[PDB]
Design a binder for this molecule. Structure first.
Ligand SMILES: [Mg+2]
Ligand SMILES: [Mg+2]
Ligand SMILES: [Mg+2]
Ligand SMILES: [Mg+2]
Ligand SMILES: [Mg+2]
Ligand SMILES: [Mg+2]
Ligand SMILES: [Mg+2]
Ligand SMILES: [Mg+2]
Ligand SMILES: [Mg+2]
Ligand SMILES: [Mg+2]
Ligand SMILES: [Mg+2]
Ligand SMILES: [Mg+2]
Ligand SMILES: [Mg+2]
Ligand SMILES: [Mg+2]
Ligand SMILES: [Mg+2]
Ligand SMILES: [Mg+2]
Ligand SMILES: [Mg+2]
Ligand SMILES: [Mg+2]
Ligand SMILES: [Mg+2]
Ligand SMILES: [Mg+2]
Ligand SMILES: [Mg+2]
Ligand SMILES: [Mg+2]
Ligand SMILES: [Mg+2]
Ligand SMILES: [Mg+2]
Ligand SMILES: [Mg+2]
Ligand SMILES: [Mg+2]
Ligand SMILES: [Mg+2]
Ligand SMILES: [Mg+2]
Ligand SMILES: [Mg+2]
Ligand SMILES: [Mg+2]
Ligand SMILES: [Mg+2]
Ligand SMILES: [Mg+2]
Ligand SMILES: [Mg+2]
Ligand SMILES: [Mg+2]
Ligand SMILES: [Mg+2]
Ligand SMILES: [Mg+2]
Ligand SMILES: [Mg+2]
Ligand SMILES: [Mg+2]
Ligand SMILES: [Mg+2]
Ligand SMILES: [Mg+2]
Ligand SMILES: [Mg+2]
Ligand SMILES: [Mg+2]
Ligand SMILES: [Mg+2]
Ligand SMILES: [Mg+2]
Ligand SMILES: [Mg+2]
Ligand SMILES: [Mg+2]
Ligand SMILES: [Mg+2]
Ligand SMILES: [Mg+2]
Ligand SMILES: [Mg+2]
Ligand SMILES: [Mg+2]
Ligand SMILES: [Mg+2]
Ligand SMILES: [Mg+2]
Ligand SMILES: [Mg+2]
Ligand SMILES: [Mg+2]
Ligand SMILES: [Mg+2]
Ligand SMILES: [Mg+2]
Ligand SMILES: [Mg+2]
Ligand SMILES: [Mg+2]
Ligand SMILES: [Mg+2]
Ligand SMILES: [Mg+2]
Ligand SMILES: [Mg+2]
Ligand SMILES: [Mg+2]
Ligand SMILES: [Mg+2]
Ligand SMILES: [Mg+2]
Ligand SMILES: [Mg+2]
Ligand SMILES: [Mg+2]
Ligand SMILES: [Mg+2]
Ligand SMILES: [Mg+2]
Ligand SMILES: [Mg+2]
Ligand SMILES: [Mg+2]
Ligand SMILES: [Mg+2]
Ligand SMILES: [Mg+2]
Ligand SMILES: [Mg+2]
Ligand SMILES: [Mg+2]
Ligand SMILES: [Mg+2]
Ligand SMILES: [Mg+2]
Ligand SMILES: [Mg+2]
Ligand SMILES: [Mg+2]
Ligand SMILES: [Mg+2]
Ligand SMILES: [Mg+2]
Ligand SMILES: [Mg+2]
Ligand SMILES: [Mg+2]
Ligand SMILES: [Mg+2]
Ligand SMILES: [Mg+2]
Ligand SMILES: [Mg+2]
Ligand SMILES: [Mg+2]
Ligand SMILES: [Mg+2]
Ligand SMILES: [Mg+2]
Ligand SMILES: [Mg+2]
Ligand SMILES: [Mg+2]
Ligand SMILES: [Mg+2]
Ligand SMILES: [Mg+2]
Ligand SMILES: [Mg+2]
Ligand SMILES: [Mg+2]
Ligand SMILES: [Mg+2]
Ligand SMILES: [Mg+2]
Ligand SMILES: [Mg+2]
Ligand SMILES: [Mg+2]
Ligand SMILES: [Mg+2]
Ligand SMILES: [Mg+2]
Ligand SMILES: [Mg+2]
Ligand SMILES: [Mg+2]
Ligand SMILES: [Mg+2]
Lengths: 48, 77
RNA sequence: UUACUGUUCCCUGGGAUUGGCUUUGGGCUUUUCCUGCGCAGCUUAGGUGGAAGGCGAAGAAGGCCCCCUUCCGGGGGGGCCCGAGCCAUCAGUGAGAUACCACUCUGGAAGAGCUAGAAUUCUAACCUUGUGUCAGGACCUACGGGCCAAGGGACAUUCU
RNA sequence: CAGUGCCGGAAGGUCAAGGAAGUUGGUGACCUGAUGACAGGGGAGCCGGCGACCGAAGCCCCGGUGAACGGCGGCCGUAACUAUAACGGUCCUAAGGUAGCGAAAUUCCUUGUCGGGUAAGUUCCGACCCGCACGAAAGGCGUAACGAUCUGGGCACUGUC
RNA sequence: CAGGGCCUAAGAUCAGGCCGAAAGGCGUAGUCGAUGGACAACAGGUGAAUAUUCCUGUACUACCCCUUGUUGGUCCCGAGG
RNA sequence: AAGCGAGUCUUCAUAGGGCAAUUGUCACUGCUUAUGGACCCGAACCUGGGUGAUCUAUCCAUGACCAGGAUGAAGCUUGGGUGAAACUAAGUGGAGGUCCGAACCGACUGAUGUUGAAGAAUCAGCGGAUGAGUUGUGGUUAGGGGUGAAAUGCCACUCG
RNA sequence: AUCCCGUGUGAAUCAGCAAGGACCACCUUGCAAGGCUAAAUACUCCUGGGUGACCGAUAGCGAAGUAGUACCGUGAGGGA
RNA sequence: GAGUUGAAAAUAAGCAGAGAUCCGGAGAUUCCCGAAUAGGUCAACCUUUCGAACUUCUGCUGAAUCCAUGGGCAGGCAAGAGACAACCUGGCGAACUGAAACAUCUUAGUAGCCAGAGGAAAAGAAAGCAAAAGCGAUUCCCGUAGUAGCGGCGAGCGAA
């Protein structure tokens, strides 16, 4: 139907460009999260 | 086959219908992708054909839940 | 076959697979500022309310000039010079003072915001190669497997 | 280069799914009406219709392209005698059949007319052009060699007669 | 002598592999597949019905057997043919 | 139709009009009707699933074959041409989808045959015969197909 | 409406959720997204009994004898 | 309980009242092909180092790669595989026909094919009916009923 921007809320475990310092809270697109951050150990998807 | 292992999706049997009401056999297919998925508990990727719904579900429940319900060992994959 | 109804190849848009940074830009804004020739006239009467108080040395009236809008009638406004005034029922006018202040409308501006569209990159999805390189008792210049690299790249492919 | 096809073009019109400002309806916590066996308005929610504007290709639009599909006309009048028409007028088209050939595997009327071959020729050869209805890569016109090809004549030869 | 116990061509099947409503389709190593490559026998005789097959002569391949001579050979692989 | 009910619908009006104010049933036998193959025999066809390339149509692999005779291209060597080259007899050479002609492949005319000797032949003649040739063995392509030097031909005496 | 599937979005837990033929209110009924279960019912390549207003060699099974045989077809198949 | 060595005589020999031939239960053997399964093949054969191939099972072993996966070796009377008339369940799924043509509709989710399992299968323990009164998993028959409905409101289809 209408494209709905997917929003994954995450914590950064290392510092990455444009994102920020280690141990940081953010919200991201699903593609960015699962295809880039997550395989490289860089981020962690959070649902407490 | 055009089948997702994980959700067991099948191609669906459907009539294409014209403005004239004239019916025709047709196939709607599962949306299948050749994807690599990260497996954290294996520290490694797995090549799979997946439905997109399956990809979703893997985001939601984590890969291992899904593969355990579908009974498919990530090792033999 | 330019009969009818369709199907298919194929082309093109939405959705999905599908991401990052940057630009440029169409339509809405968030403070806030620009802007109005019924006639009776101090005169290009903004509607509605608080309404005898405001604007000044964190420096006005008044003349010297820069800019922009323009119905060249005049309006906002930067610099400087200037130094104690522009003021209200003061009478007109359906509606009041450019003393001031709130949500705002006619269109303009600006930094900020939503959504496209568009163009440009980037690399990790995805695609394509490899007599590149490992590999089991031994091979895989036998298809293929893992790793690495190379070229593309969010296009394309596949699905709806 | 009008029609059709094909290619290229991007300014305007048209243009689906889908978005979408916004209106609109049903219900209804409730609020009032009413000498009839009831009725009228209505918040939130839920549900439904409509929907300005955004919305690609294609089409309409502009240009090219015949060894792409195909197409290549009428009517008049005129010259030392009959005649004919080089030359003019007009009409209509995208444009009006050039070179070469022509009674042809094409010619209706038709055994056209003329010449030749025969004692005698509806066939044959050459030429005229009045091409019903030739014509240029669905090629036009030539052409040595070739053909169990089609067609006319001649010598030899024969019971074909 | 002719095929098989040898080798491969066209082609066929095809472990794993890729794809596909099912059946299956494609395809790698492998394995099949002669109409080809490789490989050693002729004359005479007999003869109701067989003969390069049985008889008599000379042959020829492949193994095994002994003597002698050496110590590594065998396959996998590199090559010539 | 709510509904009324020996009445009711239409109506301002019973004013008129419409329809109503009553009726057995269960079998068996027959005749007909309907539904199934439906009185019987008779198509061309249509679709589904298999079976076929021992014939023929293309090809693939690997083999084999084509008596005999002619003709005489290039080339080459010689020898006159000029400094180079051209031009010309000569010899040699042995090309050709060359020629004549058996095998072999065809099938042009005629006669015979027509309940044939034969579901395409015999007889006399005829075309090709070193090639775009002939053929053997083993394979390939399969019917919404295949193959086609194209006839709608061929795909087991069957092929719009 | 109820039911079940492709593509995309995507809830609520009993103060709920679903159904009552678009939809809303009220009331009634029910508890989806985990499984498994006998009988009553269908059938005859057959087995054992039984009956027949069934046939009696052109009938009854194609087949009362080599019967899926002989024969025909490359084959599927036909078939006395 | 007396004769016997199939149809099936004849011949030849046996076996037999310490019980033959015969009938029933349980075992044994079961060449070659066939799922075919040591490898091959043109079924009923060949070659073999004599082997239930492959997939599951148990153990040992342990690639690229640490855990693993794959592979290798061994054990094992070893689970499966194939066959099967109709019925059944799932999957694919027509066309002639009817409609006096035909396209929606009908034929019909029928035939056919494929896969699967059983003596039956499937369904099945209310997120169900119903209607203000009540029922109490599924299946099957009678009836409701050719009713309500569906329908180029046609042919027809047809509940609860
Ligand atoms: Mg999304
Ligand atoms: Mg698309
Ligand atoms: Mg996208
Ligand atoms: Mg790269
Ligand atoms: Mg490799
Ligand atoms: Mg590699
Ligand atoms: Mg790049
Ligand atoms: Mg894309
Ligand atoms: Mg034109
Ligand atoms: Mg044109
Ligand atoms: Mg043009
Ligand atoms: Mg165009
Ligand atoms: Mg457009
Ligand atoms: Mg719209
Ligand atoms: Mg709206
Ligand atoms: Mg309303
Ligand atoms: Mg009310
Ligand atoms: Mg209301
Ligand atoms: Mg638009
Ligand atoms: Mg031309
Ligand atoms: Mg004439
Ligand atoms: Mg004539
Ligand atoms: Mg004459
Ligand atoms: Mg004559
Ligand atoms: Mg002539
Ligand atoms: Mg003509
Ligand atoms: Mg013409
Ligand atoms: Mg012509
Ligand atoms: Mg001509
Ligand atoms: Mg032409
Ligand atoms: Mg020609
Ligand atoms: Mg000539
Ligand atoms: Mg010829
Ligand atoms: Mg081969
Ligand atoms: Mg195969
Ligand atoms: Mg396999
Ligand atoms: Mg192979
Ligand atoms: Mg062999
Ligand atoms: Mg041989
Ligand atoms: Mg030998
Ligand atoms: Mg030999
Ligand atoms: Mg003999
Ligand atoms: Mg001899
Ligand atoms: Mg001797
Ligand atoms: Mg020897
Ligand atoms: Mg070698
Ligand atoms: Mg009356
Ligand atoms: Mg019939
Ligand atoms: Mg037809
Ligand atoms: Mg068929
Ligand atoms: Mg076949
Ligand atoms: Mg064959
Ligand atoms: Mg053949
Ligand atoms: Mg032949
Ligand atoms: Mg050959
Ligand atoms: Mg010979
Ligand atoms: Mg010769
Ligand atoms: Mg010669
Ligand atoms: Mg010749
Ligand atoms: Mg010749
Ligand atoms: Mg011929
Ligand atoms: Mg002859
Ligand atoms: Mg001859
Ligand atoms: Mg000849
Ligand atoms: Mg030659
Ligand atoms: Mg041919
Ligand atoms: Mg024809
Ligand atoms: Mg036949
Ligand atoms: Mg034939
Ligand atoms: Mg024919
Ligand atoms: Mg329900
Ligand atoms: Mg119901
Ligand atoms: Mg479904
Ligand atoms: Mg969903
Ligand atoms: Mg919840
Ligand atoms: Mg619902
Ligand atoms: Mg309920
Ligand atoms: Mg529950
Ligand atoms: Mg449900
Ligand atoms: Mg349950
Ligand atoms: Mg069950
Ligand atoms: Mg008889
Ligand atoms: Mg009989
Ligand atoms: Mg009798
Ligand atoms: Mg036995
Ligand atoms: Mg034996
Ligand atoms: Mg075997
Ligand atoms: Mg076998
Ligand atoms: Mg170990
Ligand atoms: Mg390891
Ligand atoms: Mg293992
Ligand atoms: Mg084992
Ligand atoms: Mg089985
Ligand atoms: Mg089976
Ligand atoms: Mg069984
Ligand atoms: Mg029909
Ligand atoms: Mg029909
Ligand atoms: Mg009909
Ligand atoms: Mg009819
Ligand atoms: Mg039972
Ligand atoms: Mg059951
Ligand atoms: Mg119970
Ligand atoms: Mg329960």
């Amino acid at each position: 139907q209408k494209k709905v921007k997917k929003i994954r809320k995450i914590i950064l475990k290392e510092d990455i460009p444009d994102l920020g310092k280690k141990g940081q809270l953010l919200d991201v697109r699903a593609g960015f999260l699962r295809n880039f951050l997550l395989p490289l150990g860089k981020a962690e998807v959070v649902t407490p | 086959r055009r089948i997702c292992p994980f959700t067991g999706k099948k191609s669906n049997k459907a009539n294409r219908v014209s403005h004239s009401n004239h019916k025709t056999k047709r196939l709607q297919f599962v949306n299948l992708q050749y994807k690599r998925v990260w497996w954290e508990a294996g520290k490694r990727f797995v090549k799979l054909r997946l439905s997109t719904k399956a990809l979703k579900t893997i985001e939601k429940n984590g890969l291992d839940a899904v593969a355990k319900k579908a009974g498919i060992d990530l090792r033999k994959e």
